[PDB]
Amino acid sequence: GEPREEAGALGPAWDESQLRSYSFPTRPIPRLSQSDPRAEELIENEEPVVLTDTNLVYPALKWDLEYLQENIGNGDFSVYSASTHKFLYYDEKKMANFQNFKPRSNREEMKFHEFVEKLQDIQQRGGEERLYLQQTLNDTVGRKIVMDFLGFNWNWINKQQGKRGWGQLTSNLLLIGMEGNVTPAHYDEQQNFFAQIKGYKRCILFPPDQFECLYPYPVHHPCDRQSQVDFDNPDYERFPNFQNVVGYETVVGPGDVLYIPMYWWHHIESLLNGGITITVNFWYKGAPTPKRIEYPLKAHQKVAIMRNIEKMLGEALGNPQEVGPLLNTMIKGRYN
Amino acid sequence: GEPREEAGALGPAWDESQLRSYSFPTRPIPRLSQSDPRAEELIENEEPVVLTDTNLVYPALKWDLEYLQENIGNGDFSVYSASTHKFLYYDEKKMANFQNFKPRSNREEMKFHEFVEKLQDIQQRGGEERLYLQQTLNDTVGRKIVMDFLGFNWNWINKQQGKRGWGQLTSNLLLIGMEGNVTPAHYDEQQNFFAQIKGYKRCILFPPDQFECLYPYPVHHPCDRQSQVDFDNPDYERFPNFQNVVGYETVVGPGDVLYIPMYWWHHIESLLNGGITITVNFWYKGAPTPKRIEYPLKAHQKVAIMRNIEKMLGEALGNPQEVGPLLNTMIKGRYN
Numbered sequence: 318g319e320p321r322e323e324a325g326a327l328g329p330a331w332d333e334s335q336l337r338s339y340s341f342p343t344r345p346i347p348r349l350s351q352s353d354p355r356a357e358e359l360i361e362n363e364e365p366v367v368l369t370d371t372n373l374v375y376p377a378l379k380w381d382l383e384y385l386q387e388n389i390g391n392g393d394f395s396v397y398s399a400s401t402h403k404f405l406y407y408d409e410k411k412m413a414n415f416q417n418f419k420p421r422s423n424r425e426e427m428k429f430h431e432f433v434e435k436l437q438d439i440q441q442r443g444g445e446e447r448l449y450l451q452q453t454l455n456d457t458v459g460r461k462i463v464m465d466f467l468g469f470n471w472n473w474i475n476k477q478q479g480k481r482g483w484g485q486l487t488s489n490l491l492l493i494g495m496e497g498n499v500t501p502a503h504y505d506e507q508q509n510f511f512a513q514i515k516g517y518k519r520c521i522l523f524p525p526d527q528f529e530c531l532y533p534y535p536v537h538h539p540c541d542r543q544s545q546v547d548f549d550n551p552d553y554e555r556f557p558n559f560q561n562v563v564g565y566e567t568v569v570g571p572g573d574v575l576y577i578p579m580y581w582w583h584h585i586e587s588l589l590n591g592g593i594t595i596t597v598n599f600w601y602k603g604a605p606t607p608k609r610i611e612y613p614l615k616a617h618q619k620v621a622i623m624r625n626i627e628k629m630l631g632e633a634l635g636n637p638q639e640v641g642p643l644l645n646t647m648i649k650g651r652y653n
Numbered sequence: 654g655e656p657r658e659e660a661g662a663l664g665p666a667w668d669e670s671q672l673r674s675y676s677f678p679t680r681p682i683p684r685l686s687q688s689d690p691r692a693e694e695l696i697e698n699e700e701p702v703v704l705t706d707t708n709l710v711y712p713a714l715k716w717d718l719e720y721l722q723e724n725i726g727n728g729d730f731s732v733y734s735a736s737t738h739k740f741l742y743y744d745e746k747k748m749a750n751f752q753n754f755k756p757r758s759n760r761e762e763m764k765f766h767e768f769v770e771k772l773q774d775i776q777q778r779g780g781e782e783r784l785y786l787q788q789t790l791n792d793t794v795g796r797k798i799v800m801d802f803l804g805f806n807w808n809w810i811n812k813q814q815g816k817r818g819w820g821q822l823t824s825n826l827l828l829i830g831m832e833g834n835v836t837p838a839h840y841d842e843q844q845n846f847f848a849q850i851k852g853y854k855r856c857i858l859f860p861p862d863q864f865e866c867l868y869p870y871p872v873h874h875p876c877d878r879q880s881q882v883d884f885d886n887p888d889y890e891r892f893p894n895f896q897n898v899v900g901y902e903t904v905v906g907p908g909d910v911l912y913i914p915m916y917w918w919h920h921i922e923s924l925l926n927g928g929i930t931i932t933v934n935f936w937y938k939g940a941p942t943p944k945r946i947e948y949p950l951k952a953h954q955k956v957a958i959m960r961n962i963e964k965m966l967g968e969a970l971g972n973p974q975e976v977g978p979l980l981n982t983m984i985k986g987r988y989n
């Protein structure tokens with residue numbers, strides 16, 4: 318809501334002009350201490366919460382481009398490129414299903430200084446071209462970064478994994494972005510802790526029961542799990558229920574950790590004119606489904622049922638492009 | 654097409670005024686000898702054919718109400734009743750899913766003479782109330798009927814079952830109806846030989862790829878497999894593709910045998926002012942599906958896929974009434 322004040326009378330951390338304007342209402346995600354019972358209650362009920370004092374990535378709070386470039390080593394890093402502010406990721410494996418899909422984002426491997434220089438050059442000419450670096454925190458990075466990575470609050474996050482009954486830590490991703498970068502609305506099938514390090518990022522989350530308002534791509538499409546709605550220019554004729562969507566909103570800064578529950582939609586943007594952003598994400602496999610299914614189902618279980626129906630139909634028909642026509646055949650004049 | 658002539662200059666077997674008028678075009682089903690290779694080719698390709706000389710139910714050609722009443726015995730027979738000419742059958746087991754479904758047909762058990770008398774009484778007062786008797790040909794009927802039943806051309810129909818690779822003979826049903834009786838359009842999941850004995854019945858068949866034009870009820874509805882379209886007063890707003898339906902038509906009389914392939918729609922009506930009708934149906938389980946599935950699929954395989962999706966969805970959601978809403982959720986703004 319109202320912008321927080323940096324310690325030491327350093328002024329507001331951000332102002333309203335750094336947030337993009339959208340067509341839907343939002344309400345705040347709770348900001349709570351990790352020792353607060355309400356925070357544990359929210360995570361257990363699969364609702365989002367911002368924890369302000371986990372110290373989850375404390376040793377990484379000194380990370381910037383200068384520190385990382387000298388200590389991360391001389392390895393190759395995956396840099397994603399976009400022509401606009403919207404980063405449009407896609408699944409290359411599913412490109413065969415949609416021969417007319419034209420990719421808008423592009424990946425490239427380079428050294429860290431190549432990433433820094435291409436970053437600085439774009440800011441110099443102001444070319445509106447934006448970049449996103451993604452890298453796994455393992456032993457392939459330099460020694461000093463490994464020391465920092467080992468210094469994460471593994472005690473806290475291991476206990477969270479234990480208490481919630483989650484599966485194994487799937488991925489631990491370092492994310493470095495440019496001001497204005499937007500990852501459009503999408504949902505994931507894993508639990509996530511979103512650990513902010515440098516700069517500020519506005520996170521807008523939508524519950525799984527907003528499926529009907531957000532219109533995800535077909536499961537076999539390369540943009541599977543992403544919303545088809547252009548938040549900047551929504552097509553109300555194709556997507557009429559986008560007029561009904563309501564989100565949960567928060568701005569996370571250094572030291573904050575946001576819990577993004579599995580199947581929850583999230584739209585993440587780096588604040589305009591806010592400098593670079595650095596985030597470390599942790600993803601965990603969800604807990605195994607309880608063997609005594611309790612009716613009526615939760616929204617996220619209906620999402621999984623719909624995903625499976627689309628998958629099985631694509632295999633049974635021998636061609637995922639026939640999924641749509643058959644589903645319409647099933648419905649028209651029978652269920653609508 | 655043109656009405657056939659009875660042997661012995663006995664005049665046309667029927668005239669056009671005995672056929673009900675419908676809104677769709679039709680073309681004739683081939684009438685062929687059972688020794689004709691074309692007939693074997695049609696049955697093997699799952700296309701309908703009228704065989705004129707099988708002698709399948711030859712000993713039953715002397716069956717009428719007087720002969721049957723004296724020789725079928727003093728057992729109970731299932732008599733279905735309808736207020737109009739349309740016999741609206743339903744699955745009582747599925748009535749729990751649709752508490753607002755009101756049955757229009759009614760079943761009652763009675764002696765054969767009770768059936769004859771209630772038949773004659775309705776014709777006397779001309780009450781437009783119509784009846785349909787259904788009974789399995791087994792050893793529970795009288796001795797003389799068993800002799801006749803044993804006299805069917807079991808050699809011919811056993812060889813057909815063998816050649817097509819069909820499963821076991823599921824049911825062998827005696828059907829006695831009144832003039833004007835209509836069994837509305839529906840499809841079955843078994844192979845059928847329709848053996849006409851007394852009177853004439855107009856059979857209108859639609860291929861399985863007419864699913865989209867005939868709008869079957871939801872699988873969990875008591876009228877599962879039946880068309881929702883009132884052929885007498887079609888609702889083109891609810892059922893727009895009924896304007897595109899095209900049928901295969903024939904009038905079968907004594908001695909004729911119609912092959913109704915599995916998943917083919919059929920609408921059967923006893924000719925107006927044509928007297929009672931008598932039919933014996935034979936149903937067989939279809940051949941096991943070939944283990945090497947050949948793409949793209951046949952229409953009837955897509956029907957089975959759609960049926961299974963509706964079934965599994967009803968079980969997964971714990972309530973078949975939620976099938977419709979979820980299917981719409983899956984489709985709207987995504988596949989339509």
Ligand SMILES: O=C(O)CNC(=O)c1c(=O)cc(CCc2ccccc2)n2[nH]cnc12
Nearest residue numbers: 451488489490492499500505585586596598
């Ligand atoms: O913070 C922001 O701006 C928003 N970014 C994201 O949500 C985000 C992301 O950045 C990176 C990955 C890749 C995760 C992965 C998958 C397979 C193997 C390794 C790693 N995913 N996956 C789902 N969401 C993301």
Ligand SMILES: O=C(O)CNC(=O)c1c(=O)cc(CCc2ccccc2)n2[nH]cnc12
Nearest residue numbers: 787824825826828835836841921922932934
């Ligand atoms: O000739 C006409 O007027 C049209 N009639 C029919 O299509 C017709 C019929 O009459 C009777 C039965 C019941 C079959 C059955 C099912 C389970 C156990 C025993 C028997 N079916 N089933 C599917 N279609 C029929």
Ligand SMILES: [Mn+2]
Nearest residue numbers: 503504505583
């Ligand atoms: Mn994500």
Ligand SMILES: [Mn+2]
Nearest residue numbers: 839840841919
């Ligand atoms: Mn039938």
